[PDB]
Amino acid sequence: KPNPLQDANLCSRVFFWWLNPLFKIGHKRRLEEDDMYSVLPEDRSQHLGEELQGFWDKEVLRAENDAQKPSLTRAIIKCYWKSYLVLGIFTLIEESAKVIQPIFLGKIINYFENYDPMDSVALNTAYAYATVLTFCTLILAILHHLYFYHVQCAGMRLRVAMCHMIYRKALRLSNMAMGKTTTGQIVNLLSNDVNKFDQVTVFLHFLWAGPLQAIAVTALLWMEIGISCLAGMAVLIILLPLQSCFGKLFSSLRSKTATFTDARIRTMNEVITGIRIIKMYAWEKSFSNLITNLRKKEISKILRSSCLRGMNLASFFSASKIIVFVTFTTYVLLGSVITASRVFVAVTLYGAVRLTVTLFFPSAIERVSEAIVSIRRIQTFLLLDEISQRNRQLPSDGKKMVHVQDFTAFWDKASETPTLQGLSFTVRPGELLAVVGPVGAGKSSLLSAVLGELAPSHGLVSVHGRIAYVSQQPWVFSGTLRSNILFGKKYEKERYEKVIKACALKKDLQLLEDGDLTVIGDRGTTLSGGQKARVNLARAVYQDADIYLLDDPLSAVDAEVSRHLFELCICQILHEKITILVTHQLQYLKAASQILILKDGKMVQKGTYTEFLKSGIDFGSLLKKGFQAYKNYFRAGAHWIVFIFLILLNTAAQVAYVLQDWWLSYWANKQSMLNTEKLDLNWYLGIYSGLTVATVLFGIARSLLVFYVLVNSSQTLHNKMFESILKAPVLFFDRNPIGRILNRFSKDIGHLDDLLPLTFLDFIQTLLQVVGVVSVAVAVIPWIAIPLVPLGIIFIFLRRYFLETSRDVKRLESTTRSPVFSHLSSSLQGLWTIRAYKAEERCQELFDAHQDLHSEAWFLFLTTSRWFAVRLDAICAMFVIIVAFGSLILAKTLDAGQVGLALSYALTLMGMFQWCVRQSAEVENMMISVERVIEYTDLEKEAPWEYQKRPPPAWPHEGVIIFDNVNFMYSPGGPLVLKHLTALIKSQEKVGIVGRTGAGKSSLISALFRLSEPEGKIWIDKILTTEIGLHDLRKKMSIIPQEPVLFTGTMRKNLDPFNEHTDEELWNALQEVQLKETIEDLPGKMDTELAESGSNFSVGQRQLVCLARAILRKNQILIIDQATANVDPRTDELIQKKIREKFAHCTVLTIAHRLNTIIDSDKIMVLDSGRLKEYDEPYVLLQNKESLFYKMVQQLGKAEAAALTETAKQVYFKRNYP
Ligand SMILES: CS(=O)(=O)CCNCc1ccc(-c2ccc3ncnc(Nc4ccc(OCc5cccc(F)c5)c(Cl)c4)c3c2)o1
Ligand SMILES: Nc1ncnc2c1ncn2[C@@H]1O[C@H](COP(=O)(O)OP(=O)(O)OP(=O)(O)O)[C@@H](O)[C@H]1O
Ligand SMILES: Nc1ncnc2c1ncn2[C@@H]1O[C@H](COP(=O)(O)OP(=O)(O)OP(=O)(O)O)[C@@H](O)[C@H]1O
Ligand SMILES: [Mg+2]
Ligand SMILES: [Mg+2]
């Protein structure tokens, strides 16, 4: 894939003529990672990184010699200034041309003021001036794009070199350095700190060419107009602090909103995650109250910030008019006269200097400050401490030997007890050493000292030969399983097959689609813990080392696989290699030649397994311790009459803007046509002031109305969408993930509230200004309407052609960016394993390859943008040339004022055209959020909360339950769960639910709660459930779920969202559940805040709270789940006795994944794959051996089965025969 930029001329490199094949391919089909162009050798990551590293090392050596801190800024300056001279040269030329061209504009107008048809030398001079103007515009329009591309490429090169240097440092941190630093800070500084280097360079040169341009413009204005230019210059200067101060308030009003936004998002997350609970207990009204209040509070600050932004944009719109008006008011009031030559040069000079002073200089200042901060951060990181390089080893005979003597290290220098106390032992090839003792107190520290991971404070460690190390926690790096096993070294088929067979990885390969070539990312999402541990072992074996180190290799795998591995892959293969093993299982100590015991880092006893057996010490004992989108977006804001009024306001603002300059032209013509007599100053100045005031007011009004209307549309959309999602059936929440649901509330509404209206208003502003420029040009010279049609057609086709590939490249440079961060993070996590083997240059090369692959797409991202901009500027320059030459061709009709107005507007079209196109693309891109929000606004809905037939307030008066031909399915058309359930449940009786796992257990509860619409009839108190509203059905029957959830809020809110109970009743419930004492000790009495999901409360406390809530509700029908699985048996007995003694007079159903505690129920419902088999007294079912209940009881055993039978018999005798 050769780079076409390597074989390009200059007339092809200034027009970007080599990108045509790529654009053609992108138009024909979609582009992939094969289609991108490989980078040039001078842009490879290794070269740039090595260059900057050499310069930085020279600088740090010089600073060390000088006894002073180093300077990354000095290093980058000394590396890049000699290549940044040339771009400064060209930007100087460009600024000179920008300042120069209005002088020739003035010369053309000056010719036109004294038109004489008979003269021809004047016509020739005017043609020459027009040609010079065309040359200046072509310089501004064509070469500037190659200059800009090189300016951007310089920053990209700096960033790539920085990334290489940062990772090279990251691969060699020391232990304390890794401890003090964090795995998140490094990726933070590689994702949000080294990305300011793409933007510091683009606006870098405008720190010295800004004031120079302002000085040149002020001198030119003084030369032409006179003292009056200081009024315009003063307004332009005053515009700087005002704009700066209009940002320090927006920052405050934007950081005030984030609190409400985050609170709303967190509450939304709670609602979405615990949706089943809210729907079951009917708390959606309270949750809607909370969410609505938060949304209103946030929208207040959004409205304030939007009004501020609108006022700022109106100021930007009207600043030029204010400057021109005040300048010329002073110019005329000082006793001078107006001629069309000077006014329309002052206008152009003011436009240029105002743009530069308003935008580019503050942008450059901000970007330079941010880049300075980022350089400081990267320098502070780079100055971290590292390990000392492995020095020249002691001269030995080359034998593979392991020895440690008098070792004593310190993980923390401020700690008291050293990690190791005077260890002294050696091991040789063919010997298997083992280490046992406590639950792991200083277990891996021996391996750390052996590998050099621990700094030896005293003693000596002699290790010779290749080493293989297995981490306690297995680590897998992003790539492929084959590449993970290879670890960068060569691949041999026979060796790989032998390792795979000896590692029992055949089944693991079979379970994967690609076998040994499966692509595995971070954290082993496509694998399992045992598989990645086996991967680690396979890596260690395949590395073919001399010394082998193991640490907890078989704790995360099963028994047979672990035994087979430890036998075949160790006792046979490694019998000729040094081995040191740390294990927790004593069954592997039989094959261990040597066994050592360590307690608290102290040498205790070492020897053979037989000797330790004779010693009488037990190791086990020692181990104990489109368009409709736009229509719907606009309609929700306000009616169509406001749309008409907005159109009128836009047109009035633009018309007044243009009419001010037209009035200046009219004044100039009227003054020129004269004779002393004097023009009436009052009339002209009054009309001028009126037009200026109209421009300002209409601009402000248009901005405010657009902002308010779009913000109101966003608010209405959000309210409708939240009310729609709150009523969706649980099938929707089952089909969608929680993150996806919360995304459309966090990011999409985040766009709609604060970015879409501003982008839309800016686009409308610029489009109207372009339309005004073209309209003035057409009105002055009516024949310009002929080529504008070809220009528009060409522009439309060009926009389609470019955007058919720009979006593809924008996604290509984004899907190839994240692997850099992924590799950095993964290599940081597995740093110890990586450094254990001598293979770190391999990881460095892989990282550099990834960085090259990303620069491969960044290059396309730059060059395609330049390719589009070149053609756009060619079109705009063609328009300017047409105007400037037609004005001279048709000179027999026009006059000085008209020509000056047309020419000045044609000159100002520069830059404005491109900004309009870019903003249109941005708006079209951002409308997808509106599309998604509107899509969520029209979701499904469930049955109405309230029905026409309101129930009498005695509906659960007795508690009769009838199931008649009840069939339930979670999804329409899916497999059936219940088949013809027919049963009757009487009042006050306790009914238990039993069955096998997956046999439709937790389905009758959902059928009773009408979570999904059932098939059949269910009668409660001789009333059908489907004839009553859901809020009249779910409200007054209670359920205790598997795991209770506590929502963030007061305890009063948690136990009574509707505030239907008083303080005395709440305290009575708390003391009846024995939680009153536990509650009345917080700083708050009973309104203390709670963490998410009760993070500070125990599971028993959650069940206690649920029981208290049920008692407070006081429902006649109650259904409990298994509740307890691992809770303290004391708490289990407490809740059992409370359930027995509190709900005697209320119907109780008991579903459970449990036993014995469900033995006292009056009747047992037996479910076989959703079929109701047995429904009768437990004793009667136990009497028959063929009954499934008896077999399920016998599945436990014989003593427990006998106890259960006795309990059932006693319950039957006491109940049925009192
Ligand atoms: C009456 S006026 O002086 O305002 C007319 C000219 N400006 C019109 C206008 C309205 C809004 C903007 C605008 C808003 C935001 C922007 N953000 C970035 N860059 C902008 N423009 C810009 C213009 C010229 C530049 O110099 C290089 C150049 C030279 C010739 C042609 C080009 F396309 C570019 C640069 Cl670097 C940026 C901008 C404008 O411009
Ligand atoms: N990754 C680590 N970073 C810093 N200190 C560590 C690390 N691993 C162990 N240590 C320290 O080494 C010493 C060994 O004690 P500890 O019992 O925690 O070791 P271990 O080998 O990780 O334990 P176990 O075998 O139970 O997993 C302690 O002082 C501990 O803080
Ligand atoms: N939300 C659901 N959507 C689709 N199928 C489901 C859903 N919940 C359960 N199932 C399926 O329905 C069958 C039985 O469901 P159920 O949850 O009642 O079984 P269980 O394991 O006996 O009960 P428990 O939830 O008490 O463990 C199983 O095949 C299960 O996979
Ligand atoms: Mg350990
Ligand atoms: Mg289940």
Swiss-Prot record:
List the record's Gene Ontology CC terms alphabetically. Answer: apical plasma membrane; basolateral plasma membrane; external side of apical plasma membrane; Golgi apparatus; intracellular membrane-bounded organelle; membrane; nucleolus; plasma membrane
Q: Which InterPro entries match?
A: AAA+_ATPase, ABC1_TM_dom, ABC1_TM_sf, ABC_transporter-like_ATP-bd, ABC_transporter-like_CS, ABC_transporter_C-like, ABCC4_TMD1, ABCC4_TMD2
Q: How does it sit in the membrane?
A: Multi-pass membrane protein
State the Gene3D superfamilies in the record.
ABC transporter type 1, transmembrane domain, P-loop containing nucleotide triphosphate hydrolases
Any one GO MF annotation of this record = ABC-type bile acid transporter activity
Q: Among its keywords, does the record have Electron transport?
A: no
Q: What class of enzyme is it?
A: translocase
Per its UniProt record, the required cofactor names are:
Mg(2+)
- In Pfam terms, one family for this protein is ABC_membrane
Mutating T1062M: what's the consequence?
A: 10% reduced expression level compared to wild-type; transport properties comparable to wild-type
Question: According to the UniProt record, what happens if one changes Y548C?
Answer: 40% reduced expression level compared to wild-type; higher transport of 9-(2-phosphonyl-methoxyethyl) adenine than wild-type
Q: Which family does it belong to?
A: Belongs to the ABC transporter superfamily. ABCC family. Conjugate transporter (TC 3.A.1.208) subfamily.
Output this protein's name. ATP-binding cassette sub-family C member 4
